[PDB]
Amino acid sequence: LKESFLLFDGDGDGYLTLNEFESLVRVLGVVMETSAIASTYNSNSKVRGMSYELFTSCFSQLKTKSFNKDEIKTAINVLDKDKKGFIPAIELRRILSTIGDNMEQKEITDLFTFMGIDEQGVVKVDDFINQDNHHHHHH
Amino acid sequence: LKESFLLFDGDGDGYLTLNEFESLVRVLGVVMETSAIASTYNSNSKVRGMSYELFTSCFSQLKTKSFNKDEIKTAINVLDKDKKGFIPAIELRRILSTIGDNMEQKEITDLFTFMGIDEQGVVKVDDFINQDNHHHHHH
Ligand SMILES: [Ca+2]
Ligand SMILES: [Ca+2]
Ligand code: NA
Ligand code: NA
């Protein structure tokens, strides 16, 4: 990963800025709110920025605290093999409980309420993934 | 402050996004790292974003945890009334110790080392304020 770190270190000093950190972690597959990524940066950077070894520690921890888009998609596709485009909201709740731990049950309900998803109904998978990316980028 | 909050709430739902929060807090005079602002947002927002009452609590706390540019400038100008453009680095250290508490002594030293400022020397005030704004925006 050192090659990739240094690639994203735009000024060649061995430290990432906050935008370079966010951009690298997203490139590497992390799916989560910008402010949560920024918060990890704030707690694990020196004045100069984030060094390679703080980065690998943070990146390991981000990786546990979240999922990637391959992971969510595989789990969704398992329940829509016919490609109808929809899954049950409660099965989405299961998946999101299962694959990353940056949502508790109460945060899932608040997310479903925000998006207009009923607990006994279905969710349109493309719209959900798109809205959730968008949400994450702005929060 | 409610009028200003709702002004920066771009979609009229009563909640700020992370960029609207950062932009409003900066407009209101807060001087501090983006990732520290983002970290406060991450800890004090619901799924929908940041409500007016979470905002006024956060904003009060940001205000204590930092300074504004009027505050630093007044304190600098007190030591350069002749407008030479320079102050002693140790007097800058005093000021930064004094007027916001998001720097400890060790973070001041690391900042001075980063900018090439010697402890027994002087600091060029315009260059310092400019570099520090820049630093804060990218970290
Ligand atoms: Ca760098
Ligand atoms: Ca809003
Ligand atoms: Na490490
Ligand atoms: Na409040």
Numbering used by the authors:
A (entry chain A), B (entry chain A): 8 to 146
Sentences reproduced from the published study:
EhCaBP5 is one of the EF hand calcium-binding proteins of E. histolytica. Sequence analysis of the calcium binding protein 5 from E. histolytica (EhCaBP5) indicates that its size (16.3 kDa) and secondary structural arrangement are similar to those of CaM like proteins but it also suggests the presence of two calcium binding loops in two separate lobes. The overall structure of EhCaBP5 is more similar to that of the essential light chain (ELC) of myosin than to CaM. Taken together, our structural studies show that EhCaBP5 resembles ELCs, and the functional studies indicate that it is likely to be the ELC of myosin 1B.
We have determined the crystal structure of EhCaBP5 at 1.9 Å resolution in the Ca2+-bound state, which shows an unconventional mode of Ca2+ binding involving coordination to a closed yet canonical EF-hand motif. Overall, the molecule is divided in two globular lobes, where each lobe has four alpha helices connected by loops. The N-terminal lobe has one EF-hand motif with a calcium ion bound to the loop between two helices. In EhCaBP5, the Ca2+ is coordinated by one carboxyl oxygen each of residues Asp16, Asp18, and Asp20, the hydroxyl oxygen of Tyr22, and two water molecules (instead of one, as observed in CaM). The extra water also binds to the 12th position glutamate of the EF hand loop; this residue is usually critical in directly coordinating Ca2+, but, in EhCaBP5, it is too far away, at a distance of about 4.1 Å, and cannot directly coordinate instead it coordinates the Ca2+ via the intervening water molecule. Overall, the Ca2+coordination geometry is octahedral in EhCaBP5, instead of being pentagonal bipyramidal as is typically found in CaM. The r.m.s.d. between these EF-hand motifs is indeed relatively large, at 2.38 Å, and the interhelical angles of the EF-hand motifs of EhCaBP5 and CaM are 64.3 degrees and 89.3 degrees respectively, indicative of the closed and open conformations respectively. The extensive hydrophobic interaction between these two helices could be the reason for the observed closed state of the lobe and water mediated Ca2+coordination or intermediate state in EhCaBP5.
